Ligand SMILES: [Cl-]
Ligand SMILES: [Cl-]
């Protein structure tokens with residue numbers, strides 16, 4: 176599923192991401208835009224053989240099991256395929272664990288490079304939330 180901007184914002188808010196660990200909703204929408212272009216089915220292979228999955232490009236080296244990242248951890252205790260669902264629940268619950276692990280949203284390179292320090296509230300402007 177390819178989310179609209181406000182649709183995703185509303186879904187993320189309902190799943191408790193607005194101001195989760197201090198990150199306003201606009202930070203999560205901006206990250207999703209640049210990580211996956213709002214497409215729950217996005218995958219991308221990394222150099223080390225791991226793969227990023229779903230709307231927030233969660234990495235199989237640490238967070239989910241895809242059966243082909245040797246020596247990887249499965250810290251969200253889910254198959255990576257669950258992160259590709261049109262229901263964002265699994266991706267959100269796993270992101271909550273990632274953003275709480277100490278490095279905040281700096282775990283998402285696109286957030287660090289394209290969202291951090293910007294006017295992220297623009298990403299939720301005009302949405303009915
Ligand atoms: Cl915001
Ligand atoms: Cl980047």
Ligand code: NA
Pocket residue numbers: 186261262263264
């Ligand atoms: Na959803």
